[PDB]
Amino acid sequence: SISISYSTTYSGWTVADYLADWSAYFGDVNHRPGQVVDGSNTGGFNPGPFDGSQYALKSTASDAAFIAGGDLHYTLFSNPSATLWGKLDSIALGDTLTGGASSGGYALDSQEVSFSNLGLDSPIAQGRDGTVHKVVYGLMSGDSSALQGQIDALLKAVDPSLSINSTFDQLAAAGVAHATPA
């Protein structure tokens, strides 16, 4: 089942409000044709260069950052082009990204919320329609809708009363979340 970690700061927030707000603040890095700039809005893989157990990206304007964890692959120019696919187990949100391939991984100096045991697996053949691609490219674009839809499905699978409209505290009471010190 999905497992959610949250700073006590967010105990009374709904997941949806937290995500809508975090993503709006992270803001669109404009990773689109004509605007991709290596080292500015590409993010990076560990160990990389285009595959690894983590993909991480910091905002081009705020300190906000996220880390996707699992077994991830980016096709670059190979068919189907510009596709992130593979197994996505976790998404961590916060600010102040640190690390990288030369450190052995990425971390957030301030990790606010993480969603683990996501169990998302997208085959390469689905290309940019795959869930993994939609979730992460949505985040890169300042749009947590795809992530929200996957979290909602995972929460309903535990119990239909649970959803992104539950508070983190409600989800902790339901057995799927736990707090970390603020």
30 binds ligand HEM (CB under 6 A): no
Report whether 113 contacts 94 (CB < 8 A). yes
| Residue 58 sits in the site that holds ligand HEM (CB under 6 A) | no
Task: Name all contacts of 48-51 with Cβ < 8 Å and 24+ positions apart.
Answer: 48/101, 50/74, 50/75, 50/76, 51/86
Measure the CA dihedral 125/78/93/35, to 10°.
-130
- Residue 133 touching ligand HEM (CB under 6 A): yes
In this structure, what DSSP letter does residue 47 have? E
What Å distances lie between residue 164 and 36, 56, 69, 94, 107, CA to CA? Answer: 32, 24, 21, 18, 25
130 binding ligand HEM? (CB under 6 A): no
> Applying CB under 6 A, which part among 4-12, 14-22, 42-50, 89-97 lies near ligand HEM?
42-50
Q: Which of 6, 19, 31, 93 binds ligand HEM (CB under 6 A)?
A: 31
Please list the helix, strand and coil fractions of the chain in percent, rounded to the nearest 5, in that order.
30, 35, 35
Task: Output 58 or 133, the one with its CB closest to ligand HEM.
Answer: 133
Question: Nearest Cα to 162, choosing from 153, 3, 117, 1?
Answer: 153
Selected from 3, 11, 137, 145, the binder of ligand HEM by CB under 6 A is 137
The SS3 assignment for 160 reads: coil
Q: Given the rule CB under 6 A, which of 9-17, 95-103, 136-144, 171-179 is the region that contacts ligand HEM?
A: 136-144
Stretch that binds ligand HEM, among 13-21, 40-48, 103-111, 173-181 (CB under 6 A): 40-48
User: By C-beta, is 55 or 168 nearer to ligand HEM?
Assistant: 55
Binding residues (CB under 6 A) for ligand HEM: these are: 31-36, 38, 42-45, 50, 55, 74, 82, 84, 128, 133, 136-137, 140
